[PDB]
Design a protein around this ligand. Structure first.
Ligand SMILES: CCCCCCCC/C=C\CCCCCCCC(=O)O[C@@H](COC(=O)CCCCCCCCCCCCCCC)COP(=O)([O-])OCC[N+](C)(C)C
Ligand SMILES: CCCCCCCC/C=C\CCCCCCCC(=O)O[C@@H](COC(=O)CCCCCCCCCCCCCCC)COP(=O)([O-])OCC[N+](C)(C)C
Ligand SMILES: CCCCCCCC/C=C\CCCCCCCC(=O)O[C@@H](COC(=O)CCCCCCCCCCCCCCC)COP(=O)([O-])OCC[N+](C)(C)C
Ligand SMILES: CCCCCCCC/C=C\CCCCCCCC(=O)O[C@@H](COC(=O)CCCCCCCCCCCCCCC)COP(=O)([O-])OCC[N+](C)(C)C
Ligand SMILES: CCCCCCCC/C=C\CCCCCCCC(=O)O[C@@H](COC(=O)CCCCCCCCCCCCCCC)COP(=O)([O-])OCC[N+](C)(C)C
Ligand SMILES: CCCCCCCC/C=C\CCCCCCCC(=O)O[C@@H](COC(=O)CCCCCCCCCCCCCCC)COP(=O)([O-])OCC[N+](C)(C)C
Ligand SMILES: CCCCCCCC/C=C\CCCCCCCC(=O)O[C@@H](COC(=O)CCCCCCCCCCCCCCC)COP(=O)([O-])OCC[N+](C)(C)C
Ligand SMILES: CCCCCCCC/C=C\CCCCCCCC(=O)O[C@@H](COC(=O)CCCCCCCCCCCCCCC)COP(=O)([O-])OCC[N+](C)(C)C
Ligand SMILES: CCCCCCCC/C=C\CCCCCCCC(=O)O[C@@H](COC(=O)CCCCCCCCCCCCCCC)COP(=O)([O-])OCC[N+](C)(C)C
Ligand SMILES: CCCCCCCC/C=C\CCCCCCCC(=O)O[C@@H](COC(=O)CCCCCCCCCCCCCCC)COP(=O)([O-])OCC[N+](C)(C)C
Ligand SMILES: CCOc1ccc(-c2nc3ccc(-c4nc5ccc(N6CCN(C)CC6)cc5[nH]4)cc3[nH]2)cc1
Ligand SMILES: Nc1ncnc2c1ncn2[C@@H]1O[C@H](COP(=O)(O)OP(=O)(O)OP(=O)(O)O)[C@@H](O)[C@H]1O
Ligand SMILES: Nc1ncnc2c1ncn2[C@@H]1O[C@H](COP(=O)(O)OP(=O)(O)OP(=O)(O)O)[C@@H](O)[C@H]1O
Ligand SMILES: [Mg+2]
Lengths: 657, 568
């Protein structure tokens, strides 16, 4: 379910959406009343002369003067209610002729000299007279002010439409952006509430994509649905309302055209989905092949495989090109020439309708309606191609929405908890633990021990022997399947995770360096400040702080591999943990961290209960309790000195090289 | 439009499709001016007293004929133009891949993988878009626009067209300016979004520490701050993106209003007719598009020029290793020898190698072991023709490597890379790189000789795994089995056995000794057990062999006593 969640999230920030819809409606009203001003201007002012004329008063009674008499139209006239002394202006060819008498039924007209007879029954012939270019202008003059008023009204409505179009678009974009921001905040909160089991299986790229790229896709969808579908729907509804207001017998034709959009939309989407899916799949295959060839080119050259890899690449290229050509054919046929054909068919329909009206009618013809229809149909047929394009595109956004909302709907989670004021003394008791990452497996068989207030405990075992699985099990990243762990007098599983993790701190093989300043890194930007960071420098960091270019050595990514461990131990010292679960540290890689790794380790280890998983076994000379891992079980204990562990190959002379 | 000239070769190769496209485009442009003028004439006839059913039939039929002709010719020119665009894209892709397949390691050191992938993924798109769409927009701006303008100037009016055309140049200028501004704000906002993505990835990778220090609230706060910043940048982008529709709407409504008003003030003077006014309105409506086409051209031409200038630069890179002219006719390699070889990796320190001055007689296998960084894979790198020649002479029984051709030499040498590079393809076929003929069962025999027959069922299915990058200790075994099936005159084992067990190591090495008997075999390892049999053992110290003695001379002299470690 994608639409339901999208609608629920859009209901948040509904004020912006409603305001955008209202502003869009006002703008559409203005733009679509423009063409109605056009129709009125054409029909009343340019075609005004066609109407009947009557004898006029001497003064400017909406009157015009012709020879020794003056006439006035039947509309601007003011109730003389005279039926005789009529007049008419009749257009033939390109010239207008004046008829001093009422001609009764009117039809087709042809003039020989002064007849201008009206031809279904040819018996009526009036007396005519040609109108000079000056006479016609004099007759048309009274409508100049109405022309001016309508032009000014058109301009004013246009500027209002401009303002409100800008407003509605801006508010739609604001609503989409705010919705996406809320979605991102909620997604990151849920990610922070997830369990480590979820993180371990899925690579980092997958979670980052789900957080930031699918949300961008949702943003694209929201902008597409809001600005192109709702906007176009309102625009078409307004256009059709205007057309119905103009002529009803000619708007039903456009209503019947509306299904054309649906039919072609579905057909084009049906073919486009297939063609685009194949094109995308083959393009991904080609990119993967090119990447797999650039990497590992040396072997391809060595085995002279340059004639077969190119063969497969050319086969993929041919398939992709063929599908691209088919897509081009479909696009050309369905979309654009089809829009043109529909537009020309609409023109033909207009001509047919109005010609049929005109052939047997006297004054039925109205060219203002024709012009308004032409303008409205030009506007209507603009965005259809975009509509079908977005309709075909929506599938990818739908898939991304499905992914994101499946992530958000996950039920398995953990409660937040709160930090505990009490500092648990150094005590970690293992009554027994049995842990496995699968079902039916046992990675840790039986491990039992206890650590005192001050001790250095280390784990002994071969690579992949569950040495840091106990680090995982102690922070409650992975809960114990059947065993129990005990800190102080209560089991680890009876307390909130955030209370436990306050007691104890970690340092890993690869120090995770956080973006920002070095001082920020050693503090992670917490409330604690002042000597929190500086104290690390006064404990075991002496050379780096003297390199003080900016507060606490403000600097940028990556240093090397020694300063990383230095920063990690500085962090562990600043946070003042209790149990300080350490991890394998690779220490001689640089110089023994300038021969300071041991100093840092044994200064942080003081006054704690510290677990060392160090690969090098010489660094654990001091340990009082040293444990071993029989692939998840303790089979002996002791120390390099206390017991015989130094002998018996368990502590190899090879490890001491 | 320098991009259209740099592609002269393509247009010269394809001149029929493009000349047909231009002819059809011009014909369609000329034909499309008829419908609106016929509408104007029909309205004029309507108003006058001369309109009969015959005229209506004439107009309907001629409109249908023009519609059909425009449809068919439009389809054909679009097909003939975008087929050319697709052809150019395919040609560029096949040229780029063919060039990459000839490029040696030095080029890939100079050129990063990301740059090459971008050139083969995006620049080709830009050049193909140029070839098709840029031509379309050039025709639209140069011919369609002028055609419509002259039609409105001649048939309808020369004053009305001048009056109603003023806003459209301003519309084009404003569109260009707002495009530039929106592009700038969009690149800024994309930088902000990239920073947010980097923060998200960095705080989701090291989640272990973040949770262990109960800092999962400051992380949320920082993410919220980054989201607020990216939202602010997006709103900055929107502030300008919302200025496109209003400006075009204003400057097109003004054009329609000017046309209608100044035609109503002209029809009064009897210098027009309503049919001509409607024709003018339709002409403006269709003339709208060239205004956008001009900007589209002015943008696509520059983008294509840059991308093509990038695709051509990466294509015209001279081959690092030169196949010799008039290669010497040598059937097989006999006693290899190095006279004085001091190689130097391009962009390296000092020499990195010095005269090796050793000989490997035909059939006598030599093992080289030593210190990391001293260089033992550099000898085989010299021998593989991967980097240009060094110094002295690498004499292959009289004729140096530089004269033997690349094809035959690559035929002789069987190479097992230290860094394993097997491809993501069927294991049965991945092993088959050595020889494509494959017979049927020689692959099984090679598996047995390499001792990979230990794989009975432990891998999924049989000989079909997509080695999805399935893990295991089978990668080295597959590499050695492939190199063995190749049946090479010279076998170069680069630290191949650095992962298998000692028992299997002895099995493999003694099998190679007891199966590759009349041919050379190079063993490179850091463990002195595999080189045990070698009749001339070399231990390299920095850039010079410490001594040239055999196993007994080596173990006696003051070289490196690591076999004294004995590893047990
Ligand atoms: C926001 C939208 C607002 C849109 C506003 C739209 C306004 C138009 C409405 C007014 C029309 C007036 C009719 C013409 C006329 O005679 O008036 C004046 C011309 O004035 C003009 O109309 C000419 C200049 C018009 C420029 C319009 C610019 C729009 C931007 C006076 O003309 P005249 O001097 O009497 O000419 C005598 C010539 N003779 C001597 C040869 C006989
Ligand atoms: C998001 C969704 C997007 C959809 C987009 C696509 C939308 C597509 C379509 C939509 C348009 C729907 C109609 C628009 C409203 C105007 C209709 C009108 O005025 O009726 C006219 C038609 O009346 C008849 O004669 C019948 C009024 O004419 P009348 O002769 O005055 O009517 C006499 C009888 N009466 C007055 C009792 C009615
Ligand atoms: C829905 C989504 C889209 C939005 C809808 C879009 C659909 C329709 C909008 C376009 C329709 C044509 C409007 C023409 C108006 C005009 O210019 O005036 C003309 C007459 O018109 C009138 O007398 C009516 C005034 C209508 C105002 C426009 C909005 C309401 C449209 C109808 C509402 C119902 C149908 C629509 C709503 C369902 C001519 O000018 P005038 O007025 O004679 O000038 C003198 C006036 N004065 C003396 C006062 C100065
Ligand atoms: C024998 C052919 C017969 C062939 C008729 C083909 C189908 C036309 C159906 C609609 C129709 O009657 O057309 C109508 C309009 O609409 C059109 O002409 C355009 C649709 C009628 O077109 P008309 O016959 O020219 O009469 C015009 C009358 N009217 C203006 C009042 C509509
Ligand atoms: C016709 C295309 C086939 C011939 C193209 C041609 O000869 O070369 C051209 C291809 O570059 C172009 O100029 C192609 C132009 C094609 C579209 C033109 C639209 C103009 C429309 C407007 C309405 C130029 O490339 P060249 O390599 O510079 O070749 C000419 C110079 N020479 C003769 C010295 C080589
Ligand atoms: C042996 C003989 C050969 C001469 C041609 C055949 C004899 C008939 C001639 C008809 C005629 O006189 O023309 C008349 C038009 O035509 C019509 O009245 C019928 C409709 C056809 C014209 C409109 C569609 C044309 C294109 C599609 C055609 C079908 C599809 C094509 C694809 C297959 C015009 O008559 P006129 O006497 O010229 O005077 C009036 C002129 N005026 C009205 C045009 C201004
Ligand atoms: C200022 C415009 C101007 O003076 O135009 C006037 C004179 O002048 C022109 O006709 C100017 C037209 C020049 C066009 C030059 C570019 C195109 C090539 C063109 C190569 C040739 C327009 O007046 P007209 O010429 O009478 O045209 C109006 C038509 N009418 C009488 C139907 C109204
Ligand atoms: C030319 C001198 C530089 C002008 C300039 O500001 O460059 C800019 C504009 O540049 C231009 O407007 C002219 C060159 C066309 C590029 C912009 C196309 C329209 C974008 C709509 C370059 O802008 P760009 O987005 O880098 O391209
Ligand atoms: C016609 C479109 C507007 C229509 C109105 C309503 C639309 C509503 C819909 C909203 C969708 C979501 C918000 C808008 C996102 C795109 C904004 C944008 O213009 O960016 C582009 C502007 O740069 C160019 O493409 C250069 C060409 C000139 C400007 C083209 C834009 C339209 C001009 C008229 C991309 O910039 P870039 O720098 O080339 O990007 C590549 C590099 N980078 C990714 C690393 C940054
Ligand atoms: C031809 C088409 C015309 C279109 C309509 C033209 C007028 C449009 C009317 C107003 C837009 C602003 C005009 C410019 C003012 C100076 C800039 C400014 O204040 O920017 C700041 C405020 O920007 C905003 O807050 C813009 C959105 C507010 C107006 C929305 C409703 C307008 C009706 C930018 O703030 P920030 O840095 O993002 O934080
Ligand atoms: C009250 C009077 O108010 C009016 C309101 C609107 C219009 C109006 N009528 C139009 C007809 C067509 C177009 C239009 N034609 C186009 C062709 C191409 C494009 N492109 C090209 C590529 N990029 C630039 C975007 C899409 C946009 C296009 N927009 C715009 C139009 N604007 C006229 C008067
Ligand atoms: N995060 C994990 N996801 C899945 N399986 C895991 C995970 N951690 C350990 N395992 C399981 O551990 C076994 C592989 O060895 P394991 O990962 O236990 O070595 P290790 O505990 O990391 O030890 P060491 O630190 O010594 O390398 C398999 O059963 C594997 O499924
Ligand atoms: N890209 C390179 N450019 C220059 N010199 C290089 C490059 N890669 C490696 N070298 C040189 O080769 C050394 C590492 O590879 P080399 O084969 O010379 O020694 P090795 O490590 O003993 O061999 P192996 O790779 O078998 O372990 C580097 O220390 C340097 O001297
Ligand atoms: Mg572990």
């Amino acid at each position: 379910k994608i639409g339901k969640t999208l609608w629920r999230y859009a209901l948040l920030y509904r004020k912006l959406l409603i305001t955008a819809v209202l502003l869009l409606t006002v703008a559409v009203g203005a733009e679509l009343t423009g063409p109605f001003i056009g129709k009125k201007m054409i029909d009343d002012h340019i075609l005004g002369i066609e109407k009947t004329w009557y004898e006029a008063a001497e003064k400017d009674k909406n009157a015009v003067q012709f020879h020794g008499v003056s006439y006035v139209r039947e509309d601007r006239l003011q109730e003389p209610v005279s039926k005789a002394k009529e007049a008419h202006i009749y257009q033939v060819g390109m010239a207008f002729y004046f008829v001093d008498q009422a001609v009764s039924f009117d039809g087709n007209r042809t003039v020989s000299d002064g007849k201008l007879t009206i031809t279904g029954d040819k018996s009526r012939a009036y007396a005519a007279e040609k109108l000079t270019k000056q006479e016609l202008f004099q007759f048309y003059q009274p409508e100049i002010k109405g022309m001016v008023l309508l032009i000014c009204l058109y301009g004013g409505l246009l500027v209002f439409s401009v303002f409100f179009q800008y407003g509605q678009h801006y508010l739609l974009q604001m609503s989409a952006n705010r919705i996406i921001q809320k979605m991102r905040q909620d997604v990151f909160s849920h990610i922070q509430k997830m369990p480590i089991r979820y993180f371990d299986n899925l690579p980092a790229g997958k979670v980052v994509a789900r957080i930031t790229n699918d949300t961008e896709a949702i943003r694209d969808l929201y902008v597409t649905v809001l600005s192109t579908f709702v906007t176009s729907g309102i625009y078409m509804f307004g256009i059709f309302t205007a057309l119905f207001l103009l002529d009803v017998k000619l708007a039903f034709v456009c209503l019947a055209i509306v299904p054309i959009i649906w039919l072609w939309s579905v057909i084009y989407r049906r073919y486009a989905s297939y063609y685009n899916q194949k094109i995308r799949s083959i393009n991904s295959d080609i990119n993967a092949k090119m990447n797999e060839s650039i990497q590992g080119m040396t072997i391809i050259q060595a085995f002279r495989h340059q004639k077969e890899t190119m063969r497969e690449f050319e086969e993929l290229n041919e398939s992709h090109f063929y599908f691209q050509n088919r897509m081009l054919n479909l696009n050309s046929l369905m979309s654009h020439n089809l829009v043109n054909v529909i537009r020309n068919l609409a023109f033909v329909c207009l001509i047919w309708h109005f010609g049929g009206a005109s052939l047997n009618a006297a004054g039925i013809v109205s060219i203002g309606v024709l012009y308004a229809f032409v303008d409205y149909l030009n506007r209507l047929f603009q965005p259809i191609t975009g509509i079908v394009n977005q309709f075909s595109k929506l599938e990818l956004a739908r898939v991304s929405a499905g992914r994101v909302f499946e992530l958000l709907e996950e039920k398995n989670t953990e409660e937040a908890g709160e930090p505990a004021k009490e500092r648990a003394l150094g005590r970690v008791e293992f009554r027994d633990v049995s842990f496995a990452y699968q079902e039916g497996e046992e990675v840790l068989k039986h491990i039992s021990f206890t650590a005192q207030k001050g001790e250095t405990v280390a784990l002994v075992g071969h690579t992949g022997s569950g040495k840091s699985s106990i680090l995982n099990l102690l922070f409650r990243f992975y809960d114990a399947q059947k065993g129990d762990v005990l800190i102080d007098g209560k089991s680890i599983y009876n307390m909130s995770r955030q209370e436990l993790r306050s007691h104890m701190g970690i340092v890993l093989q690869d120090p995770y360096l956080f973006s920002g300043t070095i001082g920020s890194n050693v503090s992670l930007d917490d409330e604690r400040m002042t000597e929190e960071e500086i104290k690390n420098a006064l404990r075991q960091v002496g050379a780096e702080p003297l390199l003080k270019k900016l507060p606490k050595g403000i600097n940028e990514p990556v240093l090397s591999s020694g300063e990383r461990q230095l920063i990690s131990f500085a962090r562990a010292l600043a946070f003042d943990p209790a149990i300080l679960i350490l991890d394998e540290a690779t220490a001689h890689i640089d110089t023994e961290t300038e021969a300071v790794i041991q100093k840092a380790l044994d200064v942080v280890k003081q006054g704690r209960t510290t677990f060392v998983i160090a690969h090098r076994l010489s660094t654990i000379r001091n340990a009082d309790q040293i444990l071993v891992l029989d692939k998840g079980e303790i089979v002996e204990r002791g120390n390099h000195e206390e017991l015989m562990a130094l002998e018996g190959q368990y502590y190899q002379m090879y490890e001491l090289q | 439009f320098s991009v259209l000239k740099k592609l002269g070769w393509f247009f010269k190769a394809y001149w029929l499709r493009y000349t047909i496209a231009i002819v059809l485009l011009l014909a369609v442009n000329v034909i499309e001016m008829f419908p609106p003028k016929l509408l104007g004439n029909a309205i004029d006839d309507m108003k006058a007293g001369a309109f009969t059913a015959e005229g209506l039939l004439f107009y309907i039929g001629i409109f249908f004929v023009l519609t059909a002709a425009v449809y068919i010719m439009s389809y054909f020119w679009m097909h003939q133009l975008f087929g050319g665009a697709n052809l150019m894209e395919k040609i560029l892709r096949t040229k780029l891949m063919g060039h990459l397949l000839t490029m040696s390691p030095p080029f890939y050191e100079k050129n990063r993988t990301g740059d090459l992938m971008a050139r083969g993924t995006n620049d080709l798109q830009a050049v193909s878009l140029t070839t098709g769409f840029g031509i379309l927009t050039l025709v639209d701006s140069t011919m369609f626009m002028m055609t419509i303008f002259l039609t409105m100037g001649f048939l309808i009016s020369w004053k009305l067209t001048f009056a109603a055309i003023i806003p459209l140049p301003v519309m084009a200028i404003a569109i260009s300016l707002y495009g530039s501004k929106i592009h700038e704000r969009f690149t800024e906002a994309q930088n902000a979004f990239g920073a947010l993505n980097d923060r998200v990835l960095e705080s989701v990778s090291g989640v272990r520490v973040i949770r262990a220090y109960v800092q999962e609230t400051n992380d949320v706060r920082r993410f919220n701050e980054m989201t607020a910043d990216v939202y602010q940048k997006n709103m900055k982008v929107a502030f300008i993106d919302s200025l496109f529709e209003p400006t075009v709407k204003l400057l097109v409504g003004a054009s329609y209003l000017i046309g209608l008003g100044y035609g109503a003030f002209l029809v009064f003077r009897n210098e027009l007719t309503l049919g001509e006014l409607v024709s003018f309105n339709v002409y403006l409506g269709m003339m709208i598009w060239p205004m956008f086409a001009i900007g589209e051209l002015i943008n696509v031409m520059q983008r294509g020029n840059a991308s093509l200038d990038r695709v051509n630069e990466t294509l015209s890179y001279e081959t690092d290793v030169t196949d010799p002219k008039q290669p010497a006719d040598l059937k097989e390699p006999g006693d290899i020898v190095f006279s004085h070889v001091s190689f130097t990796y391009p962009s390296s320190t000092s020499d990195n190698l010095q005269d090796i001055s050793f000989t490997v007689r035909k059939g006598q296998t030599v093992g080289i072991a030593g210190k990391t960084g001293s260089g033992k894979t550099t000898i085989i790198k010299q021998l593989l023709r991967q980097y240009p020649p060094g110094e002295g002479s690498i004499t292959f029984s009289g004729v140096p490597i530089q004269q033997i051709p690349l094809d035959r030499l690559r035929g002789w040498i069987g190479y097992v890379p230290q860094d394993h590079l097997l491809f993501s393809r069927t294991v049965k076929e991945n092993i088959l790189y050595g020889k494509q003929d494959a017979t049927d069962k020689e692959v099984q025999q090679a598996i047995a000789e390499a001792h990979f027959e230990k794989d009975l069922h432990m891998l999924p299915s049989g000989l079909e795994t997509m080695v999805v990058a399935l893990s295991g200790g089978q990668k080295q075994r597959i590499s050695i089995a492939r190199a063995l099936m190749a049946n090479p005159e010279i076998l170069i084992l680069d630290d191949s056995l650095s992962a298998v067990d000692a028992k299997t190591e002895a099995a493999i090495i003694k099998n190679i000794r007891e199966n590759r008997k009349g041919k050379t075999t190079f063993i490179l390892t850091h463990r002195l057990s595999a080189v045990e049999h070698a009749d001339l053992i070399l231990v390299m110290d920095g850039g010079v062999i410490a001594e040239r003695g055999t196993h007994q001379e080596l173990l006696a002299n003051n070289g490196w006593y690591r076999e004294q470690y004995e590893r047990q």
